[PDB]
Structures are given as C-alpha cells and as structure tokens.
Amino acid sequence: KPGSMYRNVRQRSFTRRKYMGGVPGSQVIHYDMGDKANTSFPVKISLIVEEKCQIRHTALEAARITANRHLVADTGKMGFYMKLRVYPHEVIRENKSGMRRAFGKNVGTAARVKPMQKIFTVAVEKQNFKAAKEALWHAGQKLPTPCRIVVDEGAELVQ
Amino acid sequence: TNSHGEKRCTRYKLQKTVRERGISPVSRAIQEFEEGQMVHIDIDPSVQKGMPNPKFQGSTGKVIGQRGRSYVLEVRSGNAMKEVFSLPQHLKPQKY
Amino acid sequence: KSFIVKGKFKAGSTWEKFTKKIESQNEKNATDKTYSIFGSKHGVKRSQVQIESVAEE
Amino acid sequence: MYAVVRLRGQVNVRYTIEDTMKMLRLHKVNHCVFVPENPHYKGMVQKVKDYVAYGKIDAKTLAEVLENRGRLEGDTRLTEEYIRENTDYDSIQAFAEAVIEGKSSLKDIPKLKPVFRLHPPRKGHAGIKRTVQQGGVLGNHDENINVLLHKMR
RNA sequence: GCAGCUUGCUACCUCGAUGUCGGUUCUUUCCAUCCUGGCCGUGCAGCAGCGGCCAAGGGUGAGGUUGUUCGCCUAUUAAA
RNA sequence: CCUGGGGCGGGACGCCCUUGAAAAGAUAUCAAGGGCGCGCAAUGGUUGACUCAAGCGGGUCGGAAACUCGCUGAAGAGUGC
RNA sequence: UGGGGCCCCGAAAAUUGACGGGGCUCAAGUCGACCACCGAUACCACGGAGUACCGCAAGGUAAUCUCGUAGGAAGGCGUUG
RNA sequence: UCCGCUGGUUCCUUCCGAAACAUGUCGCAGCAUGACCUGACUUGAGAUCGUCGGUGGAGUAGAGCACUGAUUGGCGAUUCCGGGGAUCCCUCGCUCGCUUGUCAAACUCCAAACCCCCCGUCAUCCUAGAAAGUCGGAGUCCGGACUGCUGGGGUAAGCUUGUAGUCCGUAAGGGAGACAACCCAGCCCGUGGUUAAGGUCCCCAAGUGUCGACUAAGUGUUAAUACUAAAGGGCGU
RNA sequence: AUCAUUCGCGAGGAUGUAGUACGAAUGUCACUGCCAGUGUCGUAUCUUACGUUUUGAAGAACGGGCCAGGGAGUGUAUCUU
C-alpha cells in the first residue's frame, strides 16, 4: 500500500478516537534519541518539510531508524541528541461493494505537517555537524515530501 | 438520521460564555419596551421559558404589543414578517 | 558609466542582499537593468526586487 | 471629484458588483461618470474596482469631456452658448474649474445627462486583466486617470 | 513513479442490437529483447554462466491432456 | 419503495441530539457519533433548610474498604434514559 | 556551505503525425520591462426599423429599450364557406 | 380499452421569459402544493440590488491548550492504590506538578475576513405607480459545467454527493487549431471610425519590434484547462 | 502625411504644422448607357444538415430514398375566470 494513497491533504482532520473504532497502533517506538539529558549541544540542525503532506507512522519510523543508525555509527551512542517532533495524530482509513457505504476503516495513523515545519531536530558538537546533516539527509529520503536541512543554533560555529 | 427539533444545531447558539454561566443579571428580566421600539433578540440559554426559536437569534424585532410578561415582536425572517413572542430576558434595546 | 546598485531580492523562500556593479547610460537605466537582470537570472518580478540605492562608481 | 470609467462588460459579473455599476450609472464599457469624494462613493467605487478605472480628475480633462461628450435630453450636444444661458459661467473651462473646486455642480446644467459615453481609447489601454499596480488599466489611476480620459475623447 | 497488457471502481457513449470466448487464417505495430548482432562489468582462466547497456532487421516451430485463454507435460530447437 | 444497476445485506422509510455545514438562515449522500417507540403517586408541585464530586489532615482489630470531625473545593456532582 | 533561474538525467507502447502546421537557436523559446500596430456585431458617429411609457393630437423620452429553450401575452398573413 | 411509457402535433411578426429546486405522495420515468415565468386588475408612497457609519448575532478560518480528550521526553514528589524473589530487610510502573515536543469534524481561554437583522446616511428605483393585495394562464421538480469553499465520501476518477457566484441549457458575434458552458462580448438593420480579448516570421491582418539577461535540451514554442510526468540527482550553465 | 523643435539607451514619444488635408453622408452640376434582377463558375470569410431524444447531437443515438396528396386541441355537460 503505497504512501501516495494517504499523502495529499484534501480533507479535514480525523483524530477524535472516541468517535471511531479500532485504530492500529503506531510503529514509531521512540521520539528522543541519543543523549536525552544533555542540553549543552552547541549545534542544532533540523529537517523541515516544504510541502503540506501526511506522513504515515511507518514512514516516520523508517526515517527515524535510518537517521538514528547513521548518528549512532558516526557520532557514537551519546554523541548526539535527536528529537522526532511530530506525533502521528491523524487516523488513516481505507475503503476495503464498490462505492456503497464507502466510509473507510481505520488502517493507520499519519502526521499532518505544514510547509516549513520541523520534523527532526538533531543536536551535536561542532565536529559532528556534517554527520548530523548527512543523517538527516538520509532520513528525508524516507519521507513523502521534499525536505531541507536548516541550522537552528550554532550557525556561526559551522561557518 | 437528522432530526427536525427546535433545538436543532443549537450547541453554541444556546450556550453561555464561561463567566456568564449561572443566574443572569435580573435587570434584563424587568426591562420595559415601548410600542414600535427596536429590540435585539439575544437569547439567554438559562431562561428556558418564553424563548423564541434560535432561528431568530441575532435579529432585531420591532415591539408591536405585549402578551403578559412577554413582548410581541415583528421579526424579519428571510422575506417574511414573523410574530415572535419573547420574555424580556431574551431581549435588549437597540442603541442609537 | 559603471554604477553600484544595492538592495534585496526574494530568492525563493529567503530574501537576499546584493551589491551588484552595473554599467549603463545613467542612473535610471542602471535601475532598469538591475530589475531586468534579476528578472532574467531569478525569474522574479520587479515587485520582488527592492533597490535600496544606486550610486555612481 | 472621482472620474469613473467602465472598462469591462457585463457578462459573468456578480449581481452585487453589477448592481453597484448600475447605481453608478455605468451600464456599458467606455461610459464615464463623475462622482464626489465622500466615503459612500469611495466604497461604491472600491466595490467595482475590477471593472472600472477611476481617479481624481482635473479641470482641463473635465472641460474636454464636457465639450466633446456632454449630452442633453434628446441627445443634444452641449455647447458654450447653452452653458452661458443656463449658468453664471462664461465658458465651459470656467464651469469645469468651478465643478472641480466644488463651488458648482454638473446638475447645475439643465437637462444634462449624468453619463458621458466615451470613445474607445486611442492606441489602446493597458489591458483589462491586470490592475494599474500590475501594469494593467483596472483600478485606481489616482491623478493619472486624466491620461486615459484624454485618450478617450 | 511509468504502462494500461490483471482485476476492480465508475456509469460518459451504445438497449428502433457496434454479433459472445477460444482457436484458425492473414496483415500490421510496440519494446519492457527469448534467440540472432554489437558492447560493459564480474565473486569473467577456458568452456559456460550471472548482471547490465544498445539494438525490433530476421526468427520465435512441432506435439499429448484440456473448449480454453492460462498452465502442465513431451521431444526437437539458435531460441522455441 | 430507497439503493453508485438489480438482487443479497441494510433502512439513512416516523421521531430526537452532535458533527458534516464553509461564525445569520438553508444545505445532499447506504455521511460520522448516536438515540427513541419508555419509565416514575413519585423519580411530580410548592415552601423551608441545606450543598455536591474529589482530595488532604484527625479519629479504637470501625484497616490505607464503612461512619464521623476539620480544611480546600463555580461544580470537576446530581438532575430517570 | 546555503539560497535561487533555466536546462540535463531519472523518462518504456503499440497504423505514420502532431508546438494547429511550416519551421525557429544573441530566437520565431524563457524571464523582466517597454514601444507601435492589427484585430469584433463591443464602444463612438450618422441614417433607418421596431418596442416601452407619456401625450387630445402634433409629437416627446430611452446611458438606464432591442439574445433567447419550456412557457405566457399582443397584433397580423393564408385556406374554404 | 387503458398506460405515469415511445413517436408525432401544420402560418408570420411583436412584448416578456423560467425551472431542472423544497414538502407530501406504493413516491422515485408520475402528480400535487410552493419557489421561479407570464397577463390583468385593485391600492396609493414608499422600497432596498450597492456604499459608508453605528447598535446587535456570532464560534467558521487562523490560533491555542484554559475545559473535554489525545500526545513526547527531562526533572520533583505522591513515605498512599501496585510490577520483581516474618522485620514486607532495600530494588519501582502508573498518578500528581515544573519544564520540553506534538494534536482535534463531533475541544475552546481566544478569535478574524465574508455574511445576517435593525438604525442613520448616500446611491438607485418610484405618482409615466413603491411596497402590498386579488385573480387568469403556465412550464418545471433527468440537469450540466467553470471558479472557489483543504467542501463530505473515495486510492483516484471526464467519480459521487453538497454549497456561493457565474455560465451552458436557451447565448449570437470576436478569440483560443478545432472547444456546450475558457477569454472579449451579451446581439434590431446599414454605413464609417476606434478599440476589447487575442495577436504581429510564413500559413494569417499587424514587428524577422526595442532594451537587459537566460536556455543548447528543437528543451520550449500548452492562460483556465478532464487536453500539461514524480521522488531523487547533476564539478550543465 | 511630410517637415521643425524637444525628450528617450532604444523601438519610439510629445509639441507645432493640425482638429488642418481628408472623412459616413447630404446637396448640387456635368458626363454616361447602362443598372437592378436572374443562371452558372471562380476568389475571399463564415458555417460539421434538419426534426427529435438529450446535461450535452455533425454523431459511431432515433426518423425520413424521392415527389404529390391525406395527416393531430374537437363536441356535450358542468365549475371557475
């Protein structure tokens, strides 16, 4: 089931789970990676999507896995802090007959993100800026939107 | 399916603001209007008697008489003139 | 006949300063050529180019 | 004094904008009216900004429009002799200067029509799919309405 | 993402009828190439493979079951 | 009869509420959440007197499960469905 | 290193075919601007017809009259007696 | 015979000109009533399609977490309710707060722009008859499209079902190659002129127009468009 | 138009010449023996028949080979206007 199905935003939100029934649980396990009790990381880069889209929980999990693997391999187990900012709140549904009673059944969850919205933020030391940049580039390849990396803190510390 | 009651789609029309819930100011219940005066219809949800239809909420009526405690108003609804009965708790003078 | 034109133009999502050096007949021709150059090089209309100043070099 | 010239026609226009046009007496393209500067007329002109060109008119342009396109009941052409018979002003230039100064009114010409049916603009106009601020002809010309009025004589 | 060659969805055309499936015959086209031609890589010694690129000029058959399409099987075959 | 043909399924075939519905009103679908075809001589009327939920502290095998005291508490209760 | 314009790769379909065609490369493409012209039954002018309303009539007014399916209304043409 | 179903129904001009919608219906290819068209009469002074200002209605967009529910860690505590192998000898998940990160058709401490009622104002119409009323004749209740509303549903659909405006239907003429509904434009007849949209290398009326750049791919030479290929990449420029 | 001056980087613009010469037409004076009309063909522009069913008809939707003639709102009763 391709991500192009539940990708475009054409509809209102579908998030009130007390008026629906049976939502499959999200695949994304953690939302904070690296060293969670460190705040004195001078450089902080984030990945912002540049289109209004819906990101499925499986896409978020895939991007998170790839970025976390790259960061752990390059900077080490606690050489970085990584935050997945958005939670999949939207419930995705599918119509599984034809068009009669076509209101779908819940098949997953997605995060409805806006243009220029931060998806992932990574904090590292000065020497790991390019590694964090590379990891976030790999993470954005798993997402259904074009992305761009921005430096939030420590711009003068990289160039 | 969808009903046809008077209280249809009245969730926010017949709701009170947070800090005006409770006993309303009692001055609004003892106001007198002259014949031909223009009054607004702003329904008080806590006063459940003498309440016009919510369809006339937000309309200005002209007082054309009195029927006890309530006032008879000529209220324009689309292109018709409706006779609406209202207690003064739901009414309010227009200010010029 | 070489001028110095300063200002900012909208490059996609971010505004950008510039201090372009321009050769033209006069000051207003230099302003016109600045507008034309940025329209050609970046596809921006003249409302999206703000020329702060033009100074004879 | 506003100069209001209609430049877009009546097909596919909302009834509210078209009714505003009718209340301004602008039923056809190239027709022009002159209205005062009060906020009522300002809002009415703002309502129809996408179908008219407007601006502040000067006395010379008003004089030329009156001489070339002023009409009386029965479709008679306004002249200087009628102006001197029915007004205290010698000529049409003085009357137009008075009207611009606000000390006289176009209703002070008996049987004069409030609509000036103008010629199409010589050498064309800037285009009716863009506003004045976009390089077109629609909307507020300010004092530059007289350029367009001069080319529609 | 492509195609529209599977099946769906849909109800725009056709109900004063556009004759169904499969095969057969004959002609043609596509290329996403099975063989034949030319190449590149190889965990390519040779033989022979595997993977990929160009290329649609020619070829791509005979049989057993089954109406079959599809598929299975047989013996040839450069490939069938 | 409705019906993304018909049929099978279902009833969106009577009534009531929320959303859809785009801050007047109106607004469709086999749209979403649903509910009703009742119950009650008290579970009704009025007057008087009181104030609820839940926490915190005190009180004896009356256990951190009873009852009672104090404090907080515009309601987080109750008001038949 | 970041942000931008245009282009390239990604990019495979069935009769021979589609920027409308020819063709076009400091353009006959794209972008930012500009100049002149062509081009309606639109608009302007003249002349004419009808219509609406008014007027005893003569006539007056029409920027605010002149498209039209279902359909209503009015006045005429023709056939036979 | 009957049919709500199919086909046909014969002269001209002139004036005006819809509805493809609601409620009820063994109603769903029908009909009634109403909206909408048309004709006549009565009545006799106002009306409101538009503006501006004001008195009022807001609970949508957006925003936000203060309620209802969701939601991510960090930090501090509940010596409370409980997961792990006789002094419950000591390990601790939820729960409650202070900071962090996210949300909502059916959440709201907030909160527009449109819009609606009323008052005043200008504007327009109106004694050549406003608003109102009465009566005659209907058609119509298969619609469709474009532009918005992220409209709802749907993987999507030249899909389906809403809504506002405007069109085609019933709309010529001019222009887009052709084009129901896209642009100009609503159109009595004739002539002259000037423009609109759109175009000006030839086909084809008017530029082998001007200035400043870009493109090397015949890319492109495609307003809207059901008629136009993406993610990703490029020390191409 | 042409020319003069001036502005503009340029294509060009403005001012004067010039509201002039011209100009639909309306009169008038000469000249002329055709013109109107009709048939056919050519050049230019425009238009894919007609009636119907249709949201949409040139349709690959229905109808007609052609021509002539015939071929469809009538009467009684009653109600309303």
Ligand SMILES: [K+]
């Ligand atoms: K179907």
Ligand SMILES: [K+]
């Ligand atoms: K909250």
Ligand SMILES: [Mg+2]
């Ligand atoms: Mg049925």
Ligand SMILES: [Mg+2]
């Ligand atoms: Mg008719």
Ligand SMILES: [Mg+2]
């Ligand atoms: Mg009918």
Ligand SMILES: [Mg+2]
């Ligand atoms: Mg919102």
Ligand SMILES: [Mg+2]
């Ligand atoms: Mg339109």
Ligand SMILES: [Mg+2]
């Ligand atoms: Mg029809």
Ligand SMILES: [Mg+2]
């Ligand atoms: Mg129409």
Ligand SMILES: [Mg+2]
């Ligand atoms: Mg046309």
Ligand SMILES: [Mg+2]
């Ligand atoms: Mg006959």
